[PDB]
Amino acid sequence: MNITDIREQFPILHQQVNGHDLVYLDSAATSQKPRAVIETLDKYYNQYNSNVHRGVHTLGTRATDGYEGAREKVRKFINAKSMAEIIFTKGTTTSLNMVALSYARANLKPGDEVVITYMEHHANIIPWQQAVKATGATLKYIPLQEDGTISLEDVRETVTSNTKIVAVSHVSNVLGTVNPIKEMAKIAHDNGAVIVVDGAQSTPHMKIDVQDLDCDFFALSSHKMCGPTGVGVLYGKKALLENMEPAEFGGEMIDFVGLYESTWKELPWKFEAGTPIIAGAIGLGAAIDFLEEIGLDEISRHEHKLAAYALERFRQLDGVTVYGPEERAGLVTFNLDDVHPHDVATVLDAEGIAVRAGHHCAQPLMKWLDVTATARASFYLYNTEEEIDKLVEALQKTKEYFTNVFVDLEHH
Amino acid sequence: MNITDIREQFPILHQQVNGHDLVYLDSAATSQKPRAVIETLDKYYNQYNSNVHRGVHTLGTRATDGYEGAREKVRKFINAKSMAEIIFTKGTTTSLNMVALSYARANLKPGDEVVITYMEHHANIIPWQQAVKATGATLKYIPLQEDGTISLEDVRETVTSNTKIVAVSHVSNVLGTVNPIKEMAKIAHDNGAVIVVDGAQSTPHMKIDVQDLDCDFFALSSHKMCGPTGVGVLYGKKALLENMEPAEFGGEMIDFVGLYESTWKELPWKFEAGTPIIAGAIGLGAAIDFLEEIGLDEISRHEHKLAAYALERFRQLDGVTVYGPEERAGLVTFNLDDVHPHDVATVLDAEGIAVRAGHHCAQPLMKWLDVTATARASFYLYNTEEEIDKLVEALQKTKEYFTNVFVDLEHH
Ligand SMILES: Cc1ncc(COP(=O)(O)O)c(CN)c1O
Ligand SMILES: Cc1ncc(COP(=O)(O)O)c(CN)c1O
Prior knowledge:
The structure is a homodimer. The first copy, chain A, is of the alpha/beta class. Chain A has a domain of 257 residues: 3-Layer(aba) Sandwich (Aspartate Aminotransferase, domain 2), CATH 3.40.640.10. Chain A has 14 helices and 17 strands. In chain A, the strands form five sheets. In chain A, strands 4-10-9-8-7-5-6 form a seven-stranded mixed sheet, sandwiched between helices. In chain A, strands 13-14-17-16 form a four-stranded antiparallel sheet, with helices on one face. A two-stranded antiparallel sheet of chain A has the order 1-2. In chain A, helix 2 runs antiparallel to helix 10 and helix 11 packs parallel to helix 14. One 4'-deoxy-4'-aminopyridoxal-5'-phosphate sits at the interface of chains A and B. Chains A, B: One of its GO terms (molecular function) is pyridoxal phosphate binding.
């Protein structure tokens, strides 16, 4: 895995911000795209754009073939059994909302429980809040360990015989924690619950095997894995998807339409209403081809190296707090003592470095951490150890700057 | 308006299918894109892709500026009062589903009525079926005239004091009918109902003024108006959107998130959950710039010329039936006597001509027309009268071919 050869394919990396070479460390917010993906979109719009689900003309046939072949690429990518289990959506948020609407709100009675965690992204919190409110069920939270991980015994304690759904993140976009998804799946199944995996942060950076995880549902976003914006995937076990009603209604998802009643298509098109995200889905397939040619295990090893290096170099900094465990994905969420993270991000961008500051759409996690906001640098396959050196040097410069600005008007 | 200069900007038009120059007459299924839109997507992914809703780094600021500027472009394009009334969605289908979920299902009691028409696309039928089923309300249909138009007195007869929603198409993708949207809006308001305009087929081809139409909701799709796939718009009057609950929940649309309760953002972000369709929305803004530079009135005049020419030349054909009125948008839906429309589309594609065959996602309209399927050729700003000549010549050739294949084995 040659990182220079990889960076060469991402045109956006080769520019300056504020007179400094761009150092993009915000891939958890969104990832950048290689030329393969952009040129896939270009070839689609230049050569064979047409509405899909063929039968009539040539460009329509080519568009349909591209779209459904991207579906098959996704099926192979996460090791789903059937294309009927692969639903193209707007993103992770929409997929989780679909599960909450068509599964949760249809399978929850008073006394039932939906169990989530304190580290969940808002996308994996608010749909369940609304579903339990609509059904009169109960929302429960699995507590976290001191290092930001989840113990299996806390899972067994929180999940009960009344738990119908356990919704959990595969990888936390804040803590870097990789949750024991497989063991949690078996624990949930032992109590008669299904499991809903938020895999927005796992899918871009590590191999996904839905058959080995035995997840009942799995959600992912294209924009985080070198793919186009506005497209994502809902995977669900075919037996569960067959008994769920559609979340959206309209053309393409119908079979027979009467004046007052209608019948739906078979999976997966039952859950894809209207003209689909054709170009975006084909580009997501191109992104999958790109990542597979590089190898997800290679990318994960590279990110392990980056994360270990970054954790050590952060521990070389005085007055910096890092949140989460030692064993982690490729990201570091932190805070400088007596410097607000927003100012940290501002100064870093002045140095050309792109990080994120705020709650990272995980307010309950922020309150569990006893902070209002944090700063975060996230890595991907195009990032290098030199960029982490620049990051820690800029953090030291920031510490010194806000220190001596403080001492100067103390004297004044 | 120079049609050669316009065609020069669409690379996909300059290719051959089955050894014949491409003749794309399927723009009602989807439209093709100029270089301005494709290169807008390219510049986004090459230069300033980042997650939006800024505050931290430079590329994020540029991405946010592009996204919200596209929102402002849309507001100007349809003459909405405020950007708070412009919601980016997945497409027309999703926008109509949002209105049916968050307005209809919250404002319908038994005895209430939702009134639609027989010419409606499935996107403007099935959500209302499901909403009236969920609320115990009643679905009603406005009858059609013999020429496929809607009389205002039939509207006054169907809409009653119990009608809460009137959902109607601005332009029929099958009949070519332009419905009297403004008069229907006032009729609906006189009875205490809101009006929901399906403008997927109107927006690409004619000027939209939501303040002059006085539509309560208006839906549109980017892929039909030279814009990227997977993005559309829901417009709704700000006063109605303020009292509607969100259709989706997650990050970006929240303000405060507690363990069990949450508060929403102000409009329009209340209705945009998760990472939005950044590139697609910016490209839709580019498509709006393109169409405005050409001029929607110019495009509408060109399509009027094309439609009149096509209707005359179709009337020069023996044994061909055309459906709809004389005054129409730029499309012709038809049938050849004793030739199934699917065979018509097949032969036409063999001649390089791209038309559509089937129900066009309007099965109740097909049954009203007393046919099972039809063929359809739809026009846009890059189509010419020479292409219509090729179409009618291929239809005559098809008539003669299926005639003499029939006579040859009659003799055999
Ligand atoms: C008149 C009409 N209504 C609504 C739709 C559905 O729009 P979409 O598939 O983009 O969601 C279509 C499909 N072209 C249409 O032409
Ligand atoms: C872990 C996690 N969960 C879910 C989401 C939401 O995904 P999206 O905004 O693409 O819908 C995010 C946002 N990056 C995330 O990182």
